[model samples]
Target: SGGHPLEFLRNQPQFQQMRQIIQQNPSLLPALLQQIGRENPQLLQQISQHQEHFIQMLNEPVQEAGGQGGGG
Candidate 1:
C-alpha cells in the first residue's frame, strides 16, 4: 500500500506508450501545459514559478553524462 504508483507505472505498457508519444512529439509539451493550466491553474502557476529550477534539474543528467570523460 505504500509503494509509489510511478514505480509500478514505469514498467507498464501504457506508461511506456505515453513516454514514446511525448518523445516523438516534443511540441506537445506546450499543449500539455495548456491543458494542465486550464484544469489546474494553481499547479500550473507553481510549475511556472519553478520552471528554471525544473529545467536545470532536467538538464543535469545530460550535463553529467557529458562530464564523464571517455572510459576504458
Candidate 2:
C-alpha cells in the first residue's frame, strides 16, 4: 500500500484542479470518482449531487471546451 488510500494525495489546488480535469478526462471518472469518494467527502459531495448528469455527459460525449477560429 501507499498512503492509506485515504490520504489527500497532497494539494489544495490539485483537488480543485481535479474538477476541470474530471471534465476533460471522462474516461478517468471511475477511478477518480472512487478515489475522491473514498478519500474526499468534499469532492464527493460536490459531484455526487449530479454525477448522474455527469455520467450522462460521459455517455453523450461533450462536444467542446475550447475552440479554434480567427486565424486571420
Candidate 3:
C-alpha cells in the first residue's frame, strides 16, 4: 500500500491504478502477466529479454531533468 517499483509505467494512468491495487494484493501481478501472455504481446517477450537485466523488469530510473518531484 506504499511504494511500488512500477516506475516504468509511471506515466500510465491505468498503471497507477494497477500499482495501487497490486500494492497490497500482489496476487494480481501474476494474473496480469498471464493475461498479457495470452495476447502474445511484446511485454511477455520483454520479460524474457529483460529477465537478464534485473530482478523484475524495466530499465534503471532515468529521472527527468530538473524534475522527478517527490510526487509518487
lDDT of 2 at 58: 33
Put down candidate 1 lDDT per residue, 1-72, tens digits, no spaces.
322222222223332333444556767756655665676576556655642444332222221222124211
Please give, for residues 1-72, the per-residue lDDT of candidate 2 as tens digits: 211121232233334444456678867767766776777777556555543444433333223322232111
Ranking by TM-score: 1, 3, 2
Best by TM-score: 1
Give me the runs in candidate 3 sitting further than 4 Å from their true place. Answer: 1-13, 51-72
RMSD of each: 11.9, 12.8, 7.9
Q: lDDT for model 1, on a 0 to 1 scale? A: 0.40
How many residue pairs in model 3 have overlapping backbones?
0
Of candidate 1, the 10-residue stretch with the lowest lDDT total is 63-72
* Model 1 RMSD in angstroms: 11.9
Pairs of colliding residues, candidate 1: none
